[PDB]
Amino acid sequence: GPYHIKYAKNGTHLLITGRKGHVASMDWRKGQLRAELFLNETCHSATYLQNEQYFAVAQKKYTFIYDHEGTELHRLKQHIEARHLDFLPYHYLLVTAGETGWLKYHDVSTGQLVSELRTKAGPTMAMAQNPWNAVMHLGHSNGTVSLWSPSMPEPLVKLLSARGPV
Amino acid sequence: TIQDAVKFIEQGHVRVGPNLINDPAYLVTRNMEDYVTWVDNSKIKKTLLRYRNQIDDFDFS
Amino acid sequence: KSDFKFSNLLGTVYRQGNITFSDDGKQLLSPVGNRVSVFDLINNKSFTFEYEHRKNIAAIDLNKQGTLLISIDEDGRAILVNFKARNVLHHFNFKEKCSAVKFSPDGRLFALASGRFLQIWKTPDVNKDRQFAPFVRHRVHAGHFQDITSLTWSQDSRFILTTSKDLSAKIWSVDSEEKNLAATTFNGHRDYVMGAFFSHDQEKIYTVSKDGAVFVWEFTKRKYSWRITKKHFFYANQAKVKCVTFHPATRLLAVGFTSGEFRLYDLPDFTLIQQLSMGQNPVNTVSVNQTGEWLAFGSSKLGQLLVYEWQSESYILKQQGHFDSTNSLAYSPDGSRVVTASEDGKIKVWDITSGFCLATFEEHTSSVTAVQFAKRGQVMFSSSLDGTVRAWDLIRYRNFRTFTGTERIQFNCLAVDPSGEVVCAGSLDNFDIHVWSVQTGQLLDALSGHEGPVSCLSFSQENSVLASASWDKTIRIWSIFGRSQQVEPIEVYSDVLALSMRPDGKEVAVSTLKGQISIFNIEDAKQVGNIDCRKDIISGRFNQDRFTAKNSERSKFFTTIHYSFDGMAIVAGGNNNSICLYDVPNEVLLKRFIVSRNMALNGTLEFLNSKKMTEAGSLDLIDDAGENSDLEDRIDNSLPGSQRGGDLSTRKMRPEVRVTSVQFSPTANAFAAASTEGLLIYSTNDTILFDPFDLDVDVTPHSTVEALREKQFLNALVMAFRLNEEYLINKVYEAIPIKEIPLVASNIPAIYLPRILKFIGDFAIESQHIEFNLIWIKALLSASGGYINEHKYLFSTAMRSIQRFIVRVAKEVVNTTTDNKYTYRFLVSTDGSM
Amino acid sequence: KNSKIFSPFRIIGNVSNGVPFATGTLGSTFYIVTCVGKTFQIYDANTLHLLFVSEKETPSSIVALSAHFHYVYAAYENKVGIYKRGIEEHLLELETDANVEHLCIFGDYLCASTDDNSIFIYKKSDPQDKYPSEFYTKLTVTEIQGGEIVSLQHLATYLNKLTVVTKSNVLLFNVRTGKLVFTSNEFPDQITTAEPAPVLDIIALGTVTGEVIMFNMRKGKRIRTIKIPQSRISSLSFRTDGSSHLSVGTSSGDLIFYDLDRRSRIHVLKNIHRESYGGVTQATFLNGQPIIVTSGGDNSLKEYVFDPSLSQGSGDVVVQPPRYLRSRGGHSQPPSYIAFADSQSHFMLSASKDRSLWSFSLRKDAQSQEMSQRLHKKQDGGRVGGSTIKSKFPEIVALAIENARIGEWENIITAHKDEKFARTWDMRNKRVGRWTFDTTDDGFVKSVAMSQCGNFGFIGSSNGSITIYNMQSGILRKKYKLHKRAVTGISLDGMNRKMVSCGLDGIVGFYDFNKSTLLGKLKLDAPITAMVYHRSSDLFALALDDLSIVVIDAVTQRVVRQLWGHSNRITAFDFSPEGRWIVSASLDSTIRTWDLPTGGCIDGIIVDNVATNVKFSPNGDLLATTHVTGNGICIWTNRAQFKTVSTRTIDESEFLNDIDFNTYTSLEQIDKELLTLSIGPRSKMNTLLHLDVIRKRSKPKEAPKKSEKLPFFLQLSGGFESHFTKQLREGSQSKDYSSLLATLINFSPAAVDLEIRSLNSFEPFDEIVWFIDALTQGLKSNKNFELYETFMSLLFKAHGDVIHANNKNQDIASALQNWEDVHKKEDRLDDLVKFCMGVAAFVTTA
Amino acid sequence: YKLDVLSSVHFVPKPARVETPTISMEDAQPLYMSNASSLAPQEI
RNA sequence: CAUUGGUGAGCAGCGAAGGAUUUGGUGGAUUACUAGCUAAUAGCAAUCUAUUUCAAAGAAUUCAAACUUGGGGGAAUGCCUUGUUGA
Looking at residue C388, the DSSP 8-state letter turns out to be E
Strand partners, D637: D7, D622
What is the least distance, in Å, from the CA of A20 to any CA of chain C? 7
Length of chain E: 44
The rounded distance, in Å, linking the Cα atoms of C798 and C759 is 8
The rounded distance, in Å, linking the Cα atoms of D200 and D220 is 13
State which residues between 312 and 341 of chain D bring their CB within 7 Å of strand F: 325-326
Q: At what angle do helices D749-757 and D691-698 cross, to 10 degrees?
A: 120
Separation of D433 CA and F24 C1' (Å): 28
The rounded distance, in Å, linking the Cα atoms of D361 and D348 is 6
Strand partners, C623: A41
Residues A15, A16, A19, A20: is their CA dihedral positive or negative?
Answer: negative
- With touching defined as 3 or more inter-chain CB pairs under 8 Å, the answer for chains B and A is no
Q: At what angle do helices C770-790 and C753-763 cross, to 10 degrees?
A: 140
Strand partners, C287: C296
For residues C435, C437, C442, C448, the Cα torsion angle rounded to the nearest 10 degrees is -20
Nearest by CB: C552 against B12, B35, B40: B12
> Helix (H, G, I), strand (E, B), or coil: what is residue C460?
coil
Looking at residue E41, the DSSP 8-state letter turns out to be T
Strand partners, C493: none
What one-letter code names the amino acid at C761? G
Looking at residue D372, the DSSP 8-state letter turns out to be B
DSSP codes joined into one string, A87-128? EETTTTEEEEEETTSEEEEEETTT--EEEEEE--SSS--EEE
Q: Cβ of residue D391 near strand F, that is under 7 Å?
A: no
What is the least distance, in Å, from the CA of C387 to any CA of chain E? 14
Nearest chain C alpha carbon to B25? C641
Question: Which stretch of DSSP H or E encloses residue D741?
Answer: helix D738-746
Looking at chain B, the residues that come just before a C–N gap of over 2.5 A are none
Looking at residue C555, the DSSP 8-state letter turns out to be S
State which residues between 344 and 373 of chain C bring their CB within 7 Å of strand F: none
Looking at chain C, the residues that come just before a C–N gap of over 2.5 A are 222
The rounded distance, in Å, linking the Cα atoms of C462 and C444 is 22
Q: Cβ of residue C632 near strand F, that is under 7 Å?
A: yes
The rounded distance, in Å, linking the Cα atoms of D143 and D166 is 10
Looking at residue A41, the DSSP 8-state letter turns out to be B
> Helix (H, G, I), strand (E, B), or coil: what is residue C632?
helix
Question: Which stretch of DSSP H or E encloses residue D660?
Answer: helix D657-660
The rounded distance, in Å, linking the Cα atoms of D725 and D267 is 100
The rounded distance, in Å, linking the Cα atoms of D760 and D763 is 8
Q: Cβ of residue A131 near strand F, that is under 7 Å?
A: no
Separation of D272 CA and F16 C1' (Å): 27
Q: Cβ of residue D384 near strand F, that is under 7 Å?
A: yes
> Helix (H, G, I), strand (E, B), or coil: what is residue D308?
coil
Nearest by CB: C357 against E4, E9, E27: E27
- With touching defined as 3 or more inter-chain CB pairs under 8 Å, the answer for chains A and C is yes
Neighbours of chain D (3+ CB pairs under 8 A): C, E
Asked whether the beta carbons of D284 and D302 are under 8 A apart, the reply is no
Q: Tell me, in Å, the resolution of the deposited structure.
A: 3.0
Looking at residue C808, the DSSP 8-state letter turns out to be I
Q: Cβ of residue D27 near strand F, that is under 7 Å?
A: yes
What is the least distance, in Å, from the CA of C205 to any CA of chain A? 22
Asked whether the beta carbons of A66 and A72 are under 8 A apart, the reply is yes
Q: How many CB atoms lie within 10 A of CB E26?
A: 21
Three-state SS for C349-375 is EEECCCCCEEEEECCCCCCEEEEEECC
The rounded distance, in Å, linking the Cα atoms of C184 and C174 is 14
Output the CA–CA distances (angstroms, integers) from residue D710 to C153, C254, C522, C687, in the order listed: 31, 17, 74, 56
Asked whether the beta carbons of C419 and C427 are under 8 A apart, the reply is no
The rounded distance, in Å, linking the Cα atoms of D772 and D792 is 8
Residue C11's nearest CA partner among C675, C783, C548 is C675
> Helix (H, G, I), strand (E, B), or coil: what is residue C314?
strand
The rounded distance, in Å, linking the Cα atoms of A79 and C248 is 48
Chain centroid to CA C705: 41
- Alpha-helical segments (H) within C251-361: none
Strands C271-277 and C261-266: antiparallel
Residue D490's nearest CA partner among D461, D521, D527 is D461
Please, which residues have CB within 8 angstroms of residue C312's CB and are 6 or more apart in sequence? none
Return the exposure string of D261-294: e unless at least 16 CB atoms fall within 10 Å of the residue's CB, then b.
Answer: eeeeebbebeebbbbebbbbbbbbbbeeebbbbb
Separation of C143 CA and F48 C1' (Å): 20
Neighbours of chain B (3+ CB pairs under 8 A): C, E
Chain centroid to CA D93: 32
Nearest chain C alpha carbon to E29? C317
Contacts 24+ apart (CB under 8 A), C730-733: C730/C759, C730/C763, C730/D664, C730/D666, C731/C705, C731/D658, C731/D664, C732/C704, C732/C708, C733/C759, C733/C763, C733/C776
E23 touches chain C (CB under 8 A): no
DSSP codes joined into one string, D33-85? EEEETTEEEEEETTTTEEEEE-SS--SS---EEEEETTEEEEEETTEEEEEET
> Helix (H, G, I), strand (E, B), or coil: what is residue D10?
strand
Length of chain B: 61
Three-state SS for D178-230 is CCEEEECCCCCCCEEEEEECCCCCEEEEEECCCEEEEEECCCCEEEEEEECCC
Separation of D174 CA and F43 C1' (Å): 31
Separation of A15 CA and F68 C1' (Å): 28
Output the CA–CA distances (angstroms, integers) from residue C679 to B13, C600, C674, in the order listed: 32, 18, 5
Asked whether the beta carbons of D519 and D510 are under 8 A apart, the reply is yes
| Nucleotide whose C1' lies closest to the alpha carbon of residue A101 | F66
Residues C825, C827, C828, C829: is their CA dihedral positive or negative?
Answer: positive
The rounded distance, in Å, linking the Cα atoms of D502 and D487 is 6
Beta strands in D313-411 (DSSP E): 323-329, 335-340, 347-352, 357-361, 369-370, 396-401
State which residues between 128 and 157 of chain C bring their CB within 7 Å of strand F: 132-137, 139-143
Looking at chain E, the residues that come just before a C–N gap of over 2.5 A are 16
Residue C743's nearest CA partner among C774, C776, C789, C720 is C776
Residue D63's nearest CA partner among D95, D102, D16, D112 is D102
Looking at residue E12, the DSSP 8-state letter turns out to be B
